[PDB]
Amino acid sequence: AGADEERAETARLSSFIGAIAIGDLVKSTLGPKGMDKILLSSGRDASLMVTNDGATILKNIGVDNPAAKVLVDMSRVQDDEVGDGTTSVTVLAAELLREAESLIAKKIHPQTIIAGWREATKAARQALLNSAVDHGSDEVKFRQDLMNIAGTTLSSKLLTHHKDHFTKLAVEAVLRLKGSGNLEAIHVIKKLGGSLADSYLDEGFLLDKKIGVNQPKRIENAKILIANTGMDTDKIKIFGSRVRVDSTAKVAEIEHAEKEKMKEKVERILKHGINCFINRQLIYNYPEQLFGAAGVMAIEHADFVGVERLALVTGGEIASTFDHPELVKLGSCKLIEEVMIGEDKLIHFSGVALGEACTIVLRGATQQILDEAERSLHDALCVLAQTVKDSRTVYGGGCSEMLMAHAVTQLASRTPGKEAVAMESYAKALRMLPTIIADNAGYDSADLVAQLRAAHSEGKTTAGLDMKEGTIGDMSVLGITESFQVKRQVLLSAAEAAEVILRVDNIIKAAPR
Amino acid sequence: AGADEERAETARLSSFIGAIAIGDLVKSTLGPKGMDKILLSSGRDASLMVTNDGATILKNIGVDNPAAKVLVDMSRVQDDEVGDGTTSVTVLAAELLREAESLIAKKIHPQTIIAGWREATKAARQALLNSAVDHGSDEVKFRQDLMNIAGTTLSSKLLTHHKDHFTKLAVEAVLRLKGSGNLEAIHVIKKLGGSLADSYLDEGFLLDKKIGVNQPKRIENAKILIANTGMDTDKIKIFGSRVRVDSTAKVAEIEHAEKEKMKEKVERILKHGINCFINRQLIYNYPEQLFGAAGVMAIEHADFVGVERLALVTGGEIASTFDHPELVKLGSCKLIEEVMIGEDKLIHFSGVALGEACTIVLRGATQQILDEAERSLHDALCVLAQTVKDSRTVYGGGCSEMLMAHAVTQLASRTPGKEAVAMESYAKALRMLPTIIADNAGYDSADLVAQLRAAHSEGKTTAGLDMKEGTIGDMSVLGITESFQVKRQVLLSAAEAAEVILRVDNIIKAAPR
Amino acid sequence: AGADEERAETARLSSFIGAIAIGDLVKSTLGPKGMDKILLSSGRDASLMVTNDGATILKNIGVDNPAAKVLVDMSRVQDDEVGDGTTSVTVLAAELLREAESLIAKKIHPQTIIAGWREATKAARQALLNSAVDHGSDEVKFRQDLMNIAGTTLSSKLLTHHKDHFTKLAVEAVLRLKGSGNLEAIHVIKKLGGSLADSYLDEGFLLDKKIGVNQPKRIENAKILIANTGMDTDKIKIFGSRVRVDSTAKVAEIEHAEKEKMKEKVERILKHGINCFINRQLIYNYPEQLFGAAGVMAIEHADFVGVERLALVTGGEIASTFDHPELVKLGSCKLIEEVMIGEDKLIHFSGVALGEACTIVLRGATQQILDEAERSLHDALCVLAQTVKDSRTVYGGGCSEMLMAHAVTQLASRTPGKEAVAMESYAKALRMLPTIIADNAGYDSADLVAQLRAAHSEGKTTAGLDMKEGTIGDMSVLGITESFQVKRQVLLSAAEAAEVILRVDNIIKAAPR
């Protein structure tokens, strides 16, 4: 079957290599001051894709044959549950593998060593219920809505110079989302024109299409018409082919028949007061001359997904044949217009009666960075939704890591012999996270770690690493916090990821269903 | 893999090399006695293109991997707002990079150095509000229209002998152009025939087509008809199919139907007084005989772009079916005729009542050099149009640069330590421009630097580098002046390109896929 | 990387190499002795073209990449002014480059050297607006029409034993083209039959074609018909299909319909008295039988180019459908006939009322030399038109070059020696020409230079190199003269063309790395 199997030394090594390669790259991402990375790939990759979110970059590609992709895939479930904020879940699992060099010296029973992973659940659950997290969002909430965790997610990201304002905007978007919808109908677009606000919140839906140069500039008391069938007429579903009437003179009636399609469209249209027509496909030329005289703005080949979303927004319609007008059609009427804001022209649909669907339009600084904002909304939508629902968070700035480390030292003394040596090694791993945060800051590491441990040991969960100061301070005053979900899941599956490879000392031979 | 990550000094170096290569080529370009350059290259290039405009050449070719294309791109946005006259903006940006080698010797914090750019605000503005330059350009004007900057723009260019006259012509074009209509409707064609004037200005629009050998030579009562649909008839979209017939005689009735189509065209046409017909497509043969007898000039397969601009000029038309004659067509009426010019035959539309759109025609001797005028005219339109709107200029020949240099010298050593080195690096950058101007003309650079600084220091703004003289002289009488917004923007444009790579906060980075 | 690597020493070399190769071929050509050269290429070239005139050979073919084709191109512009006689302008420019080797001795600044070209304008102004010319050429003028300069142009050419008579003929040709035309409508052909005249002057246009086996030999009071559309008829619009009949009687109309086409052509034709028909395309067989019996000669697939000249000649016509015979057709009638010239069979159109367009028929002895005459006509027409318009001339045979040389020697010592070496070199360029004129004569070159200079110095412009004498004599008696503006342009042109690549030190490169 072309099976690739490695015995003892080689099998273990591949996991070891996979964990180390990813650790160095992800470590710089963490913290208020993160580093943006630039990735270039060939083969269905347009240009360098720069992702600040570690989970997004791993999901996108499958670089090579060594085992690590499955470990990567699991993080998505975590994302649906919580996901982002800052990425640290992958890093802790990778360092577990490094003491394995020490482990070979033990020389014969790795399985006994394994009982530590179940023990790790003990280590992780001890962390659970231990440490005051937060009071939690009531619902909507006035000032606790943001200016907290989203900013922290952003801090590692470059756009933060104007971006932090954008993050603040996103919570407003999440609060409106809760009501009856689901987790759908959120649309964001960006504009090349520069502004300090760098974004506007629209009460309705954003679209970009035009009938033609002629027609009135704006419409009011608008009525919206949506048609399943195109305005094109002649073919039927089967030719109706070679007609041959009895000279040129009667061929004219068929041309006349076209006029009948034109007239029906205007007669029915005039009574309603129709201000806008939206059709998802091709549109017949004849009606276009007629729309301009009437003062009605139509949209040719409107995208179906936008239209379908639009329908809940406008009260909906039953789309059928030209009978479609009047009562079978329901149309919202606040205002439809093409406004000209800043430079590039677009059409704004707004004032929806339903209130169950909304759209956001962004403005940028004008450059390569502008395309960055596309990925940027998506990060914001996910961070806030979970933070309000979980109602639980933990202190950032490495505050969480030092507290747990003091507790885990005790755990090694907890077990009489073999368990103790293995359990202690897991505990020392946590120490590196605080050390790395301080080192990139531009401050002396030795002074930092000694003072750090003393504050955590005392019992203050709030106290943590302050990079700006270069010393230890109160994290809570800063307002930096990490989502509660990211911490419980990493601890539970960090052990599971390493568990499938390392515990296997020998291989049978399968692959079925 | 394939990341092209470039860390610390290597990243800085790529910016450095791009700047030095560009400056040497462009330096000879700005001056009364510029050289002129020809590029051979190969592949999709013909042979020795010669461009005197630095901005045009940088955009045309993107030769290599190092970053500079985006910096180059920004020059064009400047062109819309003024652009050229002479190209000097690119040179100043490059020189600021040379001091960076000195900076590694300092080896402290590159961010700290960045402070000089921000205080460059007090430099660009120092150039501003200091030294009155002219005062005029209120609108139209008799002799201030040219014999100024346009001559200077072309002074560098070889075509100066006969062409300086052409430059004079271009401002007349801008005067008609000016209004609240921004920039629209400008068309220029060079012709293969030589005259002393080497160009005549047409009051209307120039086109090149003919109905056929028959029909009268001159209409002089010119009325214009434009049709969206061809004169061709048969298929409609309801064929009547491929057609039988018992005998050849029956097919005769079909010909007769074609005849009716001819008659409708003439009956309506004579009443209007129709003198010329222009159709943007193929034209059916039958009407052609009709037009010839009537004394009406028609154009087959007329280009659409000419028509839309022409419509603005004539007063417009509404293009529909054969109902098109009379009132639905406005038809302007001064003079339409085909006029022989020197060598090649062309058709001229003239006498436009609206006044918004006009056309320029150039002739020339008949040279490789002659095609040069097409790109040159575009440059001519851009320099003069902004000259009137800005209403402000600066002294050329290095006068502006030496003055600014005197102010920056005080700033340098006065501030102690780390900031002084940064401030002074920018300051001596200005020194190179005086050296570069004198060196290319055949005079000793060393002597020139000493004498130049002493005159500027005294307080005479007008005095500057005179290449023909070999020393210093009064710049204003020479006729060399620089656009007002080129100087505030150039300092800012030079500043941002180098600054962005040195910002983002450290970033040692690495990244996989 | 791209563009061609030239600046400093290598760039100078390309100009240098182009000048030396061209000078040897052209040097032989100068003067009555002048040597004819044979050039061979077999694909797109009929036979070796001797091309005695230097200007004609350089323009026809651009053999290679080095710069020289553009320098060559200017000479035609000179030709438009006059630019012929015997070629000398190109040679003087080339020798300017020879002492450039001396210039590397200076080893540092070529620009000081450049001021010498300006000096040349001062030096060359003593050759134009100076000396004396001839003061004849009233325009038209019956006896001063030729036997002068055209013979001189031909003196170099070998054919001038019977050829000189041909040159005399050409002025009559220039006189007839006098008017509002320019240079158009002149056709020249040659024949293989020998006669003393070697040529004949005809009243009209010559075309080689024949109708067919049948048809009258000659027509008088001839009327000319030209048709855009061929005489082929049947399918038009809607073939009426391919027809199967029910019986013999119905098919009567098809055969008869063809007859109507025949009837229109004959009945309309008879009233006019039609003697000849010319069609630029294929012709239908039925009319062909008619033309023979009627007494009318028709031409199948007549060349369109021949037809267009003929139209000015006959007063023209409007070409369309069979409505064409009568007033819409203008016929000029003298005599149209097919005649025998010595051996070959040709058709002659003659007796043009307009007089604006004419054709020349050359016969000749039966020689390689005979094809030389075709070469001669293009040169003949250009020489005479300019001579009447300029009203000024200079003495040939090297008389012009030596006089100028005496003046330039003084100039070198006037300037400082470093400058002087560069100025003197332009001056000694003139000296080589006297040596060449004598060398082709077979007389001793050393003796000739000494005696030549002494007579020119004295002040006699008329005195020059008498090749036949072996010493020096009166050029005017010989009748050899050069037009006045050939000299004005050569002196300005020779200097700056070379100067543009020597003026500049560093140049044209884009951005390799």
mmCIF file of C-alpha atoms in Angstrom, chain A residues 21 25 33-42 45 48 57 61 63 158 234-235 241-245 247-248 251 254-255 289, chain B residues 1-5 236-244 253-254 257 261 319-320 503-513:
data_model
loop_
_atom_site.group_PDB
_atom_site.id
_atom_site.type_symbol
_atom_site.label_atom_id
_atom_site.label_comp_id
_atom_site.label_asym_id
_atom_site.label_seq_id
_atom_site.Cartn_x
_atom_site.Cartn_y
_atom_site.Cartn_z
ATOM 1 C CA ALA A 21 9.100 24.339 13.030
ATOM 2 C CA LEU A 25 6.976 31.360 13.758
ATOM 3 C CA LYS A 33 3.264 44.175 20.123
ATOM 4 C CA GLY A 34 3.046 41.441 17.554
ATOM 5 C CA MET A 35 4.942 41.020 14.344
ATOM 6 C CA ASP A 36 3.270 40.814 10.955
ATOM 7 C CA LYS A 37 4.540 38.157 8.647
ATOM 8 C CA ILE A 38 4.624 38.171 4.867
ATOM 9 C CA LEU A 39 4.037 34.943 3.010
ATOM 10 C CA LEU A 40 4.589 34.318 -0.682
ATOM 11 C CA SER A 41 3.463 31.170 -2.441
ATOM 12 C CA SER A 42 3.134 29.948 -6.010
ATOM 13 C CA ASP A 45 -1.805 32.064 -4.557
ATOM 14 C CA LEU A 48 1.871 37.524 -0.535
ATOM 15 C CA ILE A 57 -2.534 30.566 7.847
ATOM 16 C CA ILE A 61 -2.254 25.241 3.198
ATOM 17 C CA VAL A 63 2.933 22.380 2.948
ATOM 18 C CA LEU A 158 -0.207 46.224 12.048
ATOM 19 C CA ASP A 234 -38.717 35.041 -27.979
ATOM 20 C CA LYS A 235 -37.134 31.550 -27.554
ATOM 21 C CA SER A 241 -38.384 27.653 -35.027
ATOM 22 C CA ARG A 242 -38.794 28.454 -38.709
ATOM 23 C CA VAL A 243 -42.044 30.496 -38.591
ATOM 24 C CA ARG A 244 -42.636 31.449 -42.308
ATOM 25 C CA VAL A 245 -45.836 33.534 -42.358
ATOM 26 C CA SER A 247 -44.470 37.701 -46.804
ATOM 27 C CA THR A 248 -42.624 40.482 -44.976
ATOM 28 C CA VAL A 251 -43.544 39.404 -39.768
ATOM 29 C CA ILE A 254 -44.213 39.494 -34.033
ATOM 30 C CA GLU A 255 -42.138 42.696 -33.674
ATOM 31 C CA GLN A 289 -35.686 53.212 -22.762
ATOM 32 C CA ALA B 1 9.866 28.495 0.904
ATOM 33 C CA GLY B 2 10.277 31.355 -1.586
ATOM 34 C CA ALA B 3 9.429 33.876 1.149
ATOM 35 C CA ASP B 4 12.006 36.617 0.223
ATOM 36 C CA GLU B 5 11.942 37.587 3.915
ATOM 37 C CA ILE B 236 -34.848 41.373 -37.559
ATOM 38 C CA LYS B 237 -34.895 38.301 -35.104
ATOM 39 C CA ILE B 238 -37.877 36.634 -36.753
ATOM 40 C CA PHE B 239 -36.442 35.363 -40.031
ATOM 41 C CA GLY B 240 -39.416 34.117 -41.957
ATOM 42 C CA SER B 241 -36.706 31.446 -42.373
ATOM 43 C CA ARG B 242 -34.650 30.540 -45.406
ATOM 44 C CA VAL B 243 -36.944 31.263 -48.337
ATOM 45 C CA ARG B 244 -38.257 29.125 -51.161
ATOM 46 C CA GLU B 253 -41.400 41.515 -54.250
ATOM 47 C CA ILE B 254 -38.605 41.030 -51.666
ATOM 48 C CA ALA B 257 -39.450 45.957 -49.622
ATOM 49 C CA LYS B 261 -36.386 51.470 -46.731
ATOM 50 C CA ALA B 319 -30.355 57.845 -31.360
ATOM 51 C CA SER B 320 -33.222 55.592 -32.155
ATOM 52 C CA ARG B 503 8.413 51.618 10.758
ATOM 53 C CA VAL B 504 6.159 48.694 11.975
ATOM 54 C CA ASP B 505 8.291 48.188 15.148
ATOM 55 C CA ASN B 506 11.455 45.949 14.813
ATOM 56 C CA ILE B 507 10.099 42.837 12.950
ATOM 57 C CA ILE B 508 13.051 40.330 12.844
ATOM 58 C CA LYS B 509 10.462 37.830 11.467
ATOM 59 C CA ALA B 510 10.283 34.557 9.573
ATOM 60 C CA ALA B 511 7.199 32.731 8.126
ATOM 61 C CA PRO B 512 6.275 29.278 6.601
ATOM 62 C CA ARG B 513 3.930 29.264 3.556
#
